[PDB]
């Protein structure tokens, strides 16, 4: 009854793809075109309820629809783990190098 | 004519709100169609009261005075959100932004010092029905998020945490582990607090207003390892308005 | 060329006591 | 292990071309990415901003591609962010910059080929620790 | 318990230094 | 704080034998000018 | 740099903030020479 | 026969038990103040938050010390290098809470201690004696201004100055090898052969003395009867022990001196403690031991690890679990 | 009755060969000023800030104005060359009079001139020389201001653009002001002499500093020392030496502070930034970086429960997070535009970040004065590859050194001047021994 939330969301797609509504933003450097402009579209615009509504994100120009398209199977989304986003951790989760 | 940081710094007013003329019984008048916002709320605690715990059953413990014991560190302030206008003609405001937490302790008698974080985050506030007017008898209600005092990071004295840290007591390494589940397995809580602010002043030619409030809201629970106390909060705030 | 110069500073020092010696100065 | 013609082989462009610097070039390099760049990424990293490193793989994913001697000159000329959309000349050294980065104004553009060479040897010889900071020190 | 025990025995040395200083053997010459 | 009871008695004696045993040989000491 | 006109004199130069420190080596040279008197 | 004079010829009498005099003046209230308040803190303080991240550190017997583990625990981070006397603490609560025992403690003792040393210096002239034993102590004094004052004075806190206790003193020195290397830095090392060498000397020549007494007890009583208090005979063979420590080397490597053989005492250990104290002084200003990492690769360039770099392996290992919570930036600048 | 190894103190009543030991000793003085000076300007290359040089004297000249521009770039190299020329030619003439003086001169002067000569127990010759240097010394601080409001200005970090070479011409003459500063708080956030941090009151102070001294010059020229000055002090050359050993070691300390913690007559932009400045140039850096991804630096709870970005200082300022929150005092040209009443304001930090500023914070972050003896940047745990200490550092830890020996010199010296003044500094007499004839303790 005891779980860690962070270990448990490992076991999901969050373990696997970028989550977008919990990874923190340096992991869109993973994925060419992506950091920072349309990393910090994507974060500012979470939470997502299927990996394709980041397309309906307004603003985006047909370059950056084309970007996100050729990425879409590199992406998830999981529900928002309160521990992950608080404190402002997607944009500094306290880890450099 | 206002003052420079080199006439503030070390006086303690760095911490205080900004105050309205005693004159200021004016009122706000809200055009329906325009918009507006909120461009500086400002709430400055006076008074930190916790509930204690009365052991027995009918008894319902009261609220006992606390001594701060964190300094001159505890006013949320440059907060700004939406302020709108709802079918009924009531206002709500939406905080967006601003230093809107402050990690507090407070020290009941006999030693125990009770940590806090004092916050108004992610605040939606309303009047009631068919304002018009901002008045010295506008009342504000609302609720606020309170997310743990500690986040996710945070490592306890013997490097145990919930994203980073150890998931055992290492230093009993054959010691059974079901009496510590409660210490080992970080936990972050996210609750709710309530708030009323009370408009007692008003400028009605620039838009500020000032006045009182009382939260109500849940103490740190150092992630899980103990049962937090509740708190009440009173002081005195500040906000100004802008046509947005 | 950090001899063409040098070496003569560093011995003008120990010159001058090799010189008041062996004629007798008020060393 | 030596510096061998084949570690000091390095891409010139994304169309495959190749470019064999001497010893020469790549010491002329290395002397001068102390001058100039290791203040900031001193090993590989970059002390101002952790997320972004030196790392061949990383400058591959990189808009345009800069593991390669033409996209390291370009973007010590014209540099821009990661996904290429903005110019970062105001806060980042470069020749375009060089009123405000002074010890980019005698650099020359030999000068920049063997810095650029350097950074795409540097992880050959020295693995992950080129870009891997003190975890591999 | 061990609180007592503690500071009990560093009592103890701040007595011994008093009777060490005023009622030590008085050093006489020759 | 969970602690070693025996600690305790170990500490008297540990003071008390050795400082008994000084006390002892110091007073026969005086008794004998 | 210096310049150029002293361009010369620029090894002598790294060497002269040096000279200070001889003098006191010199007081030892002495002393050896009168015997430590 | 006038009321200050007989004041001033009590306050400096040579007759009191122990000597007070104008330094003493200072010196008696201040070491009592700090005295007392470290023995009230050191028991039944509250615990501190040394780091200003609002995580107190419980330092003292009756919140679950033992004497090895408790302390008097540094002033906050977030005071810094401000003064935090009683009386600018809204409460003693907070004085307690933010560690203001420790900067009370800190200064009284640093004072009554400099006043100690001249003290030193004052009964020396009223006994007609030589006056540089004082100097002598200035090495002590100066390592404790060093780790009290100094060292914070640098990084700018004095939640970085030295804890009192026995734990703290290691968390110091533990802490102070990651930002500074201090076991590479030349004066620690000199500080070394101050502290090696003067336990050395100290066992040479007790042993020598020792080893060369004279005759003048029996078998049955200590030798330390062979001396009365205020002889005029030395009590010794020093030219036996010259004898035997000059064949136990060579002639003369061995004093025959013992004007030079103690001043060589007081010297050696003296000095090497200047040095070191003039090491934590300057490390306070980040003027650190060498960094000889990465200092050897070969000839293609990888690098060829050394016994430093296996020393920066273990300060890496202090440094980036050292108050694991207080830093959110990727430097530890101080 | 001393030995070699004590030998300078044979010149104790030798006034003429003790003149020539100080006026040789002048001109070593001078020659290392002059030398050191050429030698930094023939390694100088202006393209590279001077504290990535290993430079202290470069820095000295350029805050009196000469050879640099607005930002400190420096324009022209000339005057650094002829500030060391001067120098070291004007050292032989001091090398020339002190060789002759020690040599060849009167080995006492009170013969050949009684204007010249001196006893250190004629209290009157004393105080008239003291006089005369006072004098001396009131001009030298008098030539500061000239410099300041006559001869070019000095150069200002503060001034609007970045920081330029200004002339001062409203010195500040208020002396709730200038001694003020006298008796603010050497604490955190007060700082006493050091927290001086504008032009104005720096030449202001040497205007009262310079009459203060002429004044005193000759208040003792025309003076001998009262009866209770008679009756407190030891009137001997060592005596003398001993209170200027201490004299000097009281304002060594107060330089190494000075030079660590000030960056109004230590610009940062020719010595470094100052530990503190660093250290808030760090949390700058990351604020803006986070903040340009996105992140509400005002709203951003960190680990411990304060702010990540941003928090309170105990009197409720708005300051840097983090372990910086140490270092809130700090105050830097490149930071003020940042700041409000209650301190940093979010406002102009959401909006009104410069590049110009985000270049000197990164610029400053990555020059902490961290460094090794071997002279490797950074923290200690760093790899090499950076060459460089900052200058502060190199002065800060000199300076500090030879404060501390001078202080124990000062004990030394007073010490033995108190016993040889009573006579007993050669030992104690065996048939007067003083603890003999008194009574015992016990
Ligand atoms: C004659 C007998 C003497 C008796 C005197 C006894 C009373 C005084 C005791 C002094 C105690 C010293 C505490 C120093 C604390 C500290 O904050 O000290 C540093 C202060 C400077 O304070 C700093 O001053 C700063 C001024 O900078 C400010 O202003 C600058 C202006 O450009 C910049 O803008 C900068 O960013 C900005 O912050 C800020 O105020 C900082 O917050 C503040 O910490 O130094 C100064 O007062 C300079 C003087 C410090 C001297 C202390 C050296 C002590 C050496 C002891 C030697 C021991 C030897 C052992 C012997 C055996
Ligand atoms: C047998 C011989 C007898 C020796 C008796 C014992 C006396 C000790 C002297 C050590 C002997 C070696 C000295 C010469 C080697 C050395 O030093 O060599 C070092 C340099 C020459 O080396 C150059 O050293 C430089 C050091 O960097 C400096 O220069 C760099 C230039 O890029 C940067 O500017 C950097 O920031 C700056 O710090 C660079 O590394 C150059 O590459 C390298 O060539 O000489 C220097 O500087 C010389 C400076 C001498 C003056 C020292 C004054 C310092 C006072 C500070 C007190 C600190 C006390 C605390 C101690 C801890
Ligand atoms: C700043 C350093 C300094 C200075 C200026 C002096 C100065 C002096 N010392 Mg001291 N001394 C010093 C350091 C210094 N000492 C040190 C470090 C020691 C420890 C070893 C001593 C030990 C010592 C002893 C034991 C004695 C002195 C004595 C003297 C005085 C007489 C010396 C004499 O006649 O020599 C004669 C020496 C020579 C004839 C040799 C040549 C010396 C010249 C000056 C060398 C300079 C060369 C230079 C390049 C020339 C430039 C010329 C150009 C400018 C024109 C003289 C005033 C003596 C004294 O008090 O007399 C009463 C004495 O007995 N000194
Ligand atoms: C007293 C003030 C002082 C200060 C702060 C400095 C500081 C500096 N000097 Mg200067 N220097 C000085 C006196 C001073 N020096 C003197 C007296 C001389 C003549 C010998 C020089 C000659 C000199 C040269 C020739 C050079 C420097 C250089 C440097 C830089 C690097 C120093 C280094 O690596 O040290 C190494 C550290 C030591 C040698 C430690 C000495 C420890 C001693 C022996 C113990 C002392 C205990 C007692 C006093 C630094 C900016 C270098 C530089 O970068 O130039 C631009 C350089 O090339 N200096
Ligand atoms: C403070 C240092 C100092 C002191 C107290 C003395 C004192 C003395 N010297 Mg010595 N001397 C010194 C420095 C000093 N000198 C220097 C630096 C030199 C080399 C230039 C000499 C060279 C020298 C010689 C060759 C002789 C003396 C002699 C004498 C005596 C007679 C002086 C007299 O009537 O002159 C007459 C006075 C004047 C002509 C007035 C001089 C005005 C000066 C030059 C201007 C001063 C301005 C300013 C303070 C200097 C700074 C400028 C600079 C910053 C650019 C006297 C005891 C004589 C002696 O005793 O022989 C037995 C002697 O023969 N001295
Ligand atoms: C190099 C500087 C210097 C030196 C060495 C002397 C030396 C002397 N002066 Mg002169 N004086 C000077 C500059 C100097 N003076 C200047 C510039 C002036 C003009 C203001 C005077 C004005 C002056 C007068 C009016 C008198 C002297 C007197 C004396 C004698 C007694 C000094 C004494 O007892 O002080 C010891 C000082 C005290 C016992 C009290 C000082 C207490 C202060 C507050 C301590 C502060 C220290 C603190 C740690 C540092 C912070 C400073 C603080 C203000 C913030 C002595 C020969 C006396 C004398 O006999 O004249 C003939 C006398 O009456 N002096
Ligand atoms: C203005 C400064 C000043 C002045 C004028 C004097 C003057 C005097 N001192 Mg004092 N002294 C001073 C500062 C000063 N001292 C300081 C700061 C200290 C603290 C350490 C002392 C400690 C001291 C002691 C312990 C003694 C004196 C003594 C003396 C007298 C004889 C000194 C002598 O001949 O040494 C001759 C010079 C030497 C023997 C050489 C010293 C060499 C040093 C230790 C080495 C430094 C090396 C350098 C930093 C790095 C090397 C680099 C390498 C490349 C060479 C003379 C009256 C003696 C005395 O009381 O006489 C009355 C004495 O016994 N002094
Ligand atoms: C700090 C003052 C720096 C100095 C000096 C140099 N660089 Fe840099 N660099 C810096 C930052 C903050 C960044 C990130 C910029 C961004 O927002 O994207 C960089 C980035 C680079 C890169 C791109 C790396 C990648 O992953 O694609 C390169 C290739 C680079 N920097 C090279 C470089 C060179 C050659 C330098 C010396 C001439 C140099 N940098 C100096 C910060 C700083
Ligand atoms: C500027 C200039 C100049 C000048 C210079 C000079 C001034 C010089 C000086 C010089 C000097 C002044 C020198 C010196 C030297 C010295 C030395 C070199 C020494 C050595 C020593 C030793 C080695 C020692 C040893 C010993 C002894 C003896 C004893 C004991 C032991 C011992 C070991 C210590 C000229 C002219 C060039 C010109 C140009 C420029
Ligand atoms: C007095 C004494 C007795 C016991 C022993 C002890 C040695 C300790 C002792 C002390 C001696 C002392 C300290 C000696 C002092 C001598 C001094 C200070 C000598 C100074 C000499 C200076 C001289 C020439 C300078 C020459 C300058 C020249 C050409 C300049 C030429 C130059 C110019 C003009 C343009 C730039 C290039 C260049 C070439 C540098
Ligand atoms: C010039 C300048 C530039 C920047 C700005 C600023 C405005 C600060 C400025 C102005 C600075 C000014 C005006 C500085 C003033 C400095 C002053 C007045 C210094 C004070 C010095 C006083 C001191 C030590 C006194 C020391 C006293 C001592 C030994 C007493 C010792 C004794 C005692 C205590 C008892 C009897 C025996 C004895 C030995 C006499
Ligand atoms: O507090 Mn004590 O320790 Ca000198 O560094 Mn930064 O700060 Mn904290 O960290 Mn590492
Ligand atoms: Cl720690
Ligand atoms: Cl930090
Ligand atoms: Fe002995």
């Known amino acids: ?97 | 004519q206002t003052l420079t940081y080199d006439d503030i710094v070390g006086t303690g007013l760095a911490n205080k709100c900004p105050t309205l003329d005693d004159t200021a019984r004016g009122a706000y008048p809200i055009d329906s169609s325009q918009t507006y916002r909120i461009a500086r709320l400002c709430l400055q605690p006076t008074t930190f009261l916790v509930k204690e715990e009365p052991k027995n059953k009918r008894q319902e413990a009261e609220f006992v005075p606390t001594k701060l014991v964190t300094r001159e560190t505890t006013s949320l302030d440059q907060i700004q959100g939406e302020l709108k206008v709802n079918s009924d003609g009531s206002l709500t405001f939406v905080e967006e932004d601003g230093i809107d937490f402050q990690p507090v302790t407070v020290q009941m008698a006999g030693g125990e010092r009770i940590p806090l974080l004092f916050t108004v985050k992610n605040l939606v506030a309303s009047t009631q029905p068919n304002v018009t007017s901002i008045t010295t008898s506008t009342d504000f209600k609302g609720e606020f998020n309170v997310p743990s005092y500690r986040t996710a990071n945070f490592l306890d004295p013997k490097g145990r945490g919930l994203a980073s840290g150890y998931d055992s007591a290492i230093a009993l390494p054959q010691a059974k582990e079901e009496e510590l589940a409660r210490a080992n397995v970080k936990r972050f809580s996210l609750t709710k607090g309530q708030i009323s602010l009370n408009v007692a002043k008003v400028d009605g030619r620039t838009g500020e207003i000032a006045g009182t409030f009382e939260s109500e809201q849940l103490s740190d629970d150092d992630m899980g390892a103990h049962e937090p106390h509740e708190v009440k909060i009173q002081g005195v705030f500040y906000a100004s308005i802008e046509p947005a | 060329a950090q001899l063409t110069m040098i070496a003569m500073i560093g011995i003008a020092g120990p010159m001058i006591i090799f010189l008041l010696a062996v004629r007798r100065g008020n060393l | 292990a030596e510096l061998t013609p084949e570690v000091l082989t390095v891409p010139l462009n994304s169309e495959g071309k190749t470019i064999t610097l001497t010893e020469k070039q790549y010491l002329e390099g290395k002397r001068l990415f102390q001058y100039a760049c290791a203040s900031c990424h001193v090993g590989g990293i970059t002390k101002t901003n952790p997320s972004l490193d030196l790392r061949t793989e990383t400058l591959a994913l990189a808009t345009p591609p800069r593991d390669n001697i033409e996209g390291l000159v370009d973007y010590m000329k014209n540099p821009t962010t990661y996904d290429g959309e903005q110019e970062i000349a105001e806060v980042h050294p470069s020749l375009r910059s060089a009123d405000i980065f002074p010890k980019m104004r005698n650099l020359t553009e030999k000068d920049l080929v063997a810095i650029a060479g350097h950074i795409l040897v540097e992880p050959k010889i020295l693995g992950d620790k080129w870009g891997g900071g003190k975890v591999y020190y | 318990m061990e609180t007592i025990t503690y500071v009990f025995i560093f009592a103890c040395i701040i007595a011994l230094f008093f009777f060490a200083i005023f009622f030590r053997e008085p050093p006489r010459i020759t | 704080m969970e602690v070693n009871q025996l600690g305790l008695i170990a500490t008297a004696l540990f003071v008390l034998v050795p400082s008994v045993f000084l006390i002892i040989l110091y007073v026969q000491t005086e008794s004998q000018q | 740099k210096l310049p150029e006109a002293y361009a010369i004199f620029d090894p002598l130069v790294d060497v002269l903030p040096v000279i200070p420190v001889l003098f006191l080596a010199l007081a030892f040279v002495w002393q050896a020479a009168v015997g430590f008197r | 026969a006038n009321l200050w004079e007989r004041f001033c010829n009590w306050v400096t009498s040579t007759d009191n038990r122990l000597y007070v005099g104008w330094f003493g003046v200072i010196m008696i209230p201040t070491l009592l103040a700090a005295t007392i308040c470290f023995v009230i803190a050191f028991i039944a303080a509250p615990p501190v938050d040394i780091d200003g991240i609002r995580e107190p550190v419980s330092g003292s017997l009756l919140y679950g010390n033992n004497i090895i583990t408790g302390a008097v625990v540094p002033s906050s981070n977030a005071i810094g290098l401000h003064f935090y006397p009683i009386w600018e603490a809204a409460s003693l609560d907070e004085w307690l809470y933010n560690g203001g025992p420790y900067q009370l403690i800190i200064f009284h003792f640093l004072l009554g201690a400099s006043c100690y040393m001249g003290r030193q210096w004052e009964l020396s002239y009223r006994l007609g004696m030589r006056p540089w034993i004082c100097v002598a102590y200035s090495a002590p004094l100066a390592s404790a201004f060093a780790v009290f004052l100094i060292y914070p004075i640098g990084q700018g806190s004095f939640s970085d100055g030295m804890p009192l206790g026995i734990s703290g003193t290691f968390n110091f020195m533990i802490v102070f090898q990651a930002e500074h290397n201090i076991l590479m830095h030349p004066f620690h090392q000199l500080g070394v052969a101050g502290v090696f060498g003067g336990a050395l000397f100290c066992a040479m020549h007790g042993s020598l003395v020792t080893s060369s007494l004279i005759r003048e007890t029996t078998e049955t009583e200590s030798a330390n009867y062979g001396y009365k208090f205020g002889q005029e005979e030395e009590t010794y063979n020093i030219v036996a022990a010259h004898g035997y420590f000059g064949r136990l080397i060579f002639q003369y490597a061995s004093f025959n001196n013992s004007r030079s053989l103690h001043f060589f005492l007081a010297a050696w250990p003296v000095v090497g403690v200047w040095f070191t104290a003039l090491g934590i002084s300057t490390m306070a200003f980040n003027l650190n031991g060498f960094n000889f990492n990465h200092s050897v690769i070969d000839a293609k360039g990888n690098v060829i690890n050394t016994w430093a770099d296996i020393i920066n392996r273990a300060n890496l290992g202090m440094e980036v679990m050292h108050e694991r919570n207080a830093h959110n930036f990727p430097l530890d600048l101080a | 009755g001393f030995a070699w190894w004590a030998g300078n103190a044979r010149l104790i009543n030798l006034s003429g060969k003790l003149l020539g030991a100080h006026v040789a000793h002048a001109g070593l003085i001078v020659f290392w000023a002059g030398a050191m000076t050429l030698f930094e300007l023939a390694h100088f290359i202006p393209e590279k800030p001077m504290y990535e040089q290993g430079l202290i004297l470069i820095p000295h000249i350029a805050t009196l104005g000469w050879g640099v521009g607005p930002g400190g770039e420096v324009v022209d190299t000339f005057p650094f060359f002829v500030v060391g020329v001067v120098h070291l030619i004007s050292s032989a003439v001091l090398g020339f009079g002190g060789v002759y003086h020690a040599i060849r001169g009167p080995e006492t002067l009170e013969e050949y001139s009684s204007f010249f000569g001196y006893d250190w127990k004629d209290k009157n010759k004393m105080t008239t020389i003291l006089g005369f240097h006072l004098i001396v010394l009131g001009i030298g601080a008098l030539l500061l201001v000239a410099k300041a409001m006559f001869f070019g200005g000095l150069y200002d970090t503060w001034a609007p653009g970045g920081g330029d070479v200004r002339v001062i011409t409203n010195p500040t003459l208020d002396p709730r002001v200038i001694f003020g500063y006298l008796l603010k708080s050497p604490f955190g956030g007060e700082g006493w002499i050091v927290s001086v941090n504008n032009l104005e009151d720096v030449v202001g102070g040497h205007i009262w500093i310079g009459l203060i001294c002429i004044a005193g010059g000759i208040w003792h020229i025309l003076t001998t020392p009262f009866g209770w000055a008679r009756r407190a002090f030891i009137w001997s050359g060592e005596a003398y030496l001993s209170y200027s050993l201490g004299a000097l070691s009281m304002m060594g300390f107060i330089a190494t502070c000075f030079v660590w913690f000030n960056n109004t007559v230590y610009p940062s932009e020719f010595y470094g930034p100052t530990g503190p400045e660093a250290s808030q140039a760090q949390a700058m850096t990351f604020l803006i970086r986070d903040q340009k991804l996105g992140a509400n630096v005002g709203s951003a709870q960190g680990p411990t429960g304060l702010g990540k970005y941003l928090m309170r200082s105990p009197t409720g300022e708005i300051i840097f997070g983090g372990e910086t929150m140490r270092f809130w005092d700090f105050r830097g040209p490149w930071l003020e535009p940042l700041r409000g009443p209650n301190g940093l304001d979010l406002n102009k930090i959401k909006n009104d970040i410069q590049p110009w500023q985000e270049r000197r914070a990164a610029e400053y972050m990555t020059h902490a004065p961290l460094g090794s003896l071997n002279s490797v940047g950074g923290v200690a745990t760093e790899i090499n590859s950076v060459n460089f200490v900052s200058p502060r550092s190199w002065l800060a830890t000199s300076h500090f050194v030879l404060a501390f020996f001078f202080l124990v010199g000062h004990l030394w010296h007073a010490g033995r001047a108190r016993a040889a003044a009573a006579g007993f500094e050669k030992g104690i007499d065996r048939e007067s021994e003083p603890v003999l004839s008194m009574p015992s303790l016990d």
Request: glycine share 8%; net charge negative; proline share 3%.
């Open chain 1, 1 to 97: 009854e005891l779980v860690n939330v962070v270990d448990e969301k490992l076991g999901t797609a969050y373990g696997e793809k970028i989550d977008l509504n919990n990874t923190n933003i340096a992991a869109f450097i993973q994925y060419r075109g992506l950091y920072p402009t349309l990393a910090k579209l994507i974060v500012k615009n979470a939470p997502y309820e299927s990996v394709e509504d980041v397309l309906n994100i307004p603003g985006l120009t047909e370059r950056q629809k084309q970007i996100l398209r050729e990425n879409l199977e590199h992406f998830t989304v999981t529900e928002v783990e309160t521990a992950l986003v608080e404190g402002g951790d997607r944009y500094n989760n306290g880890l450099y190098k």
